[PDB]
Design a protein around this nucleic acid. Structure first.
Lengths: 106, 299, 299, 295, 111, 107, 85
DNA sequence: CATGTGGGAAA
DNA sequence: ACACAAAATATCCAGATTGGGGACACGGTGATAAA
């Protein structure tokens, strides 16, 4: 269940960061082909730099502090504490899921 | 007579010399030591770049020059790097090969540069890191809309430490044909080092003068030293047992040490007795490299 | 008097020793131990190559020598190796063969050399590995496209550890006709070895002298050691009860072990107590070897 | 009084003595146990060969010896083995003859020989195997083509494990006419053995001395021991469930290296009950062998 | 502690809500029928939570994090378990810093 | 019990000050809600006054000089000795402990 | 040596109390409250005002101890006497 | 896709 | 030296903003032999 929320977190991070940085959304992108090209290439660039940044620093504290970035996207209302405890304890599968989710967006 | 070992340290001063990177707006510094504390370091290639710059300062031909051009970090590479290059290529550096052209560049030289006569190691802060920072600046915008930079006025951080750090180095004396002309430039350069930092616009820091302990032995690269000074900098406590028995008791002999700036410590009694063994006379480190470079070299 | 054992440790220093490979641009290090932590190691063939190089350093005839050629790692073979070789082939190495010519090159020597006279094991960092790294790099690009390397200017990483490590070795006394002359050179080289790493232009350190625990008895290979020291570097705690009682209680004898540098630890009264039985007198390992090679040998 | 069982372990060290082969050329260590964990073992033939070698080391006659010769692995036949061979054949060694030479070696001795006397078992790493490995070899190529080996130079992997392993053994007291002289040498050799591997230029380790316990009982080969030691080495728990209830009797244990543990109170109470008064494993075999012997 | 994790989340959200209510006399109870009030409500929430998040993330250290947390934050009311939670906190604090960062950053309004 | 002592002394101090200012024995407040409102107002006024007083001064000698003088701890007849002997880290930590304990008591 | 200060404070307070059945309890409770007036006068000191097992040794030794860490002594009379009432 | 709670201690 | 008392009320920050750009490795090699 947490895999889906992690994927949604990554997708929301990408879309919100792009929209905040360069004020672009999907509809006007659908407007004319040049805007698809520009928005798509910028999305590739941002997801690539994020993936390159996250591919290193593989340990507890470094991964946690690099997770502190992205502003904890769409964590939403904390109806469930198990994510805070069990997933912080495991600290291994989360990195793999985050890497796969980031690589899935290109 | 054929080897030279030494370690060099510095004066205390506030030093940032940021090297790392982070989106967290804090220019992190490099830490390597693990004893429950963090120590700042300076990687050796920066010192190598400074040495190249100083060899450029004096009259010394070179094949490698840094150009200021398009944003990609680039080097103007000029002629083929030949081992008979007067200053830079022969002293250190390597000749890379991807295709190695045809018939080994007309059967010239050798693209395997194995020897790097200057051997260098990183420095250690010998002072624990402190989590202090400086709230030194806020980026600000342009008002006339001419050459407009980033849209907003951001805020960030930086951290500094009050520290002094040392590094070891070594080289083996084998050649005497072309080295004596160029080696003298290296020794002079080592006495004076200028740079080895990110930006000297702030916290320009120089580490030219302090105590030095050079040692030349025909021991085929062997060192009793540890490459480390104390917090105060009086590393010489280990030699107290070594100096006493120069004549007898089956221990190293009188010509077994060199001096530096630390000799100007207040006490004088054992300096009078230590004079009977070693060449502990040079108060100025720059003067030391003028003499002992001659003895190590051919003349 | 027919076997010689020792384990040797080093001084503390940073070590790079880039061995592994990674697409993620980080030269990884080898880990072998499983106690919840990782440790850095040294392959024995590396120190074997270093010993060969310093056998070359002193005047010693050989059949094996390294040459620089096309990227296939090649070594010049010189004359065909023979058991009655001077330095390299007799001391270690095997004469492998595929065809082995005719009737064993007219019944000359034999194509089966048992093994190396001295046997060594890999080293253990005896200090936990940490995930620290150095952002030491920024490759640049050529400017005039003359002998240009790879097009882009990429980024990568490297890691180091501040560690001191030990390694054991042992040998058996079989020959005494020609063996002594080269055993003397072997022991002298063991007293000071240098290298055993890829990177010496950066991260230079030497690791021969720290302490010796040598042993020679006609027990035919018995080891009371565990081949392990502590972080502070003394292991005499479990072996202090063993060192005494030389006369009785069937405990390891007096002239059973040798001293090192740890004898110069602060206290001396119990050093004097142990002096009555054991030969813990030599502070410098290089002097210790010059005497115990003679003692182990016929002369 | 006529049977002696024992188990021996050693000090920690990396591993060696590979047997298997790989298509992609990584040397592999043996694996036996299928329960979610792996272990490394050593066949008894290797340590039997090492024991034979060290029997050769001391002055002892023999009819078998290993010769270093052509690629084919051969052993010297020498002369016809006899049961009254002073060191090896009497100690152990089975001979089987296809033709049975001439008239049953001229109606002499006995045709088929029973090894018996000496027994052995597997050696278990008592520490799980790990997937750690090191790639090490970068062979050379001749620059003068004088007896050149394979043309290319490759890079292949090898694995080691920081492990110490134990093994049991046993022997029965049946002969006392000429046996004691050779049994003394056998106990001296087993008290200190070395090798039991091929690669000793690299991965050198020796496994003679550690906490050893032996039992001399007329049990006709029945052992309360599970034949397993602690991974950490404090296997002493099996004694606690037994020694306090002395249902093995008082004189049913011995001691080895473990006795020098700092705790001493229960050593005193066990001293009045068990004769484990030995701290040096070498000394243990010097005395208890005499007790096992008739004299 | 999972119980202390819930405590951290609750005290973070309570601090945010109470500070917003006190500083700009604004109540969510008036949400219905006043969408413009919803804009300035979300704007004020953005301002306060962003300031708090930047302040807490600005530096990491034992004494600084501890005294900022105890000074600028008002914990909830509980009878006794505060001693246990605090004493468990004082050995290790980095996980507590990460947890309070998670709780505070979860307060961002959506879109 | 270490920290429990700090909690008890803070709670006793606030109760003692509230009793000195206004009538004690809160159970007499009973049903009249306005009494609860005024009681809570006085409680929070005293608590936040102490909070500000301790917050602005948390630096070594001045902190203890204000803490010991204006607060009334328990007797701790003989158990107090350990509390006194480790006073340095005791202060270094009880600054945060006292701030937390005072902040804990709001209506 | 904090217990020494506790003991001397308690003993001297009891000495002043002795110098000059609910009735017994209230008498002790009110009298100890009265003696607190002397302490607020003493704790108004800043550096210079108002200056058992043995007498010879303390003057030889404790006199030195009094003059170097007098800043420490301020907590003793304040903390210890207040703890009583 | 969102807010909640009390009360004592000593020769 | 007797006794008396050891302070009282209001308030404890306000607003604007939290990095920008270019780039994340190049080449050569994967074991021979006896049962």
């Amino acid at each position: 269940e947490y895999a889906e929320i992690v994927y949604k977190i990554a997708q929301g991070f990408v879309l919100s960061k792009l929209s905040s940085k360069h004020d672009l959304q999907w509809s006007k992108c659908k407007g004319n082909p040049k805007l698809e090209r520009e928005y798509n290439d910028k999305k590739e660039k941002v997801v690539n730099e994020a993936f390159l940044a996250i591919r290193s620093r593989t340990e507890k504290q470094a991964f946690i502090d690099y997770f502190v970035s992205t502003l904890y996207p769409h964590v939403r209302q904390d109806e469930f504490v198990d994510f805070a405890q069990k997933l912080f304890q495991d600290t291994d599968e989360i990195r793999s899921l985050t890497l796969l989710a980031l690589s899935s967006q290109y | 007579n054929l080897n030279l070992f030494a370690t060099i340290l510095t004066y205390p001063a506030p030093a940032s010399n940021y090297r790392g990177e982070s989106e967290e707006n804090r220019s992190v510094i490099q830490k390597i030591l693990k004893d429950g504390q963090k120590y700042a370091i300076i990687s050796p290639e920066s010192m190598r770049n400074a040495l190249r710059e100083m060899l450029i300062e004096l009259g010394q031909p070179n094949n490698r020059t840094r150009l200021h051009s398009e944003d990609q970090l680039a080097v103007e590479f000029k002629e083929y790097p030949n081992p008979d290059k007067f200053a830079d290529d022969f002293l250190f550096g390597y000749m890379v090969a991807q295709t190695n052209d045809a018939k080994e560049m007309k059967k010239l030289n050798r693209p395997a540069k194995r020897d790097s006569i200057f051997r260098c190691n990183m420095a250690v802060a010998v002072n624990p890191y402190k989590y202090d920072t400086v709230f030194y600046q806020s980026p600000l915008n342009a008002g006339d809309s001419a050459w407009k930079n980033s849209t907003s006025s951001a805020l960030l951080h930086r951290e500094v430490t009050h520290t002094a750090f040392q590094y070891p180095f070594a080289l083996a004396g084998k050649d005497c044909a072309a080295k004596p002309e160029w080696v003298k430039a290296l020794l002079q350069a080592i006495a004076e080092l200028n740079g080895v930092a990110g930006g000297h616009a702030r916290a320009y820091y120089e580490f030219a003068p302090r105590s030095v302990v050079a040692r030349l032995t025909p021991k085929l690269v062997a060192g009793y030293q540890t490459y480390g000074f104390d917090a105060e900098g009086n590393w010489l406590e280990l030699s107290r047992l070594t100096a006493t028995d120069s004549d007898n008791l089956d221990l190293p002999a009188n010509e077994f040490w060199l001096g530096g700036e630390l000799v100007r410590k207040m006490d004088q009694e054992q300096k009078a007795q230590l004079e009977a063994m070693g060449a502990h006379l040079y108060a100025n480190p720059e003067k030391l490299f003028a003499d002992l470079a001659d003895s190590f070299l051919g003349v």
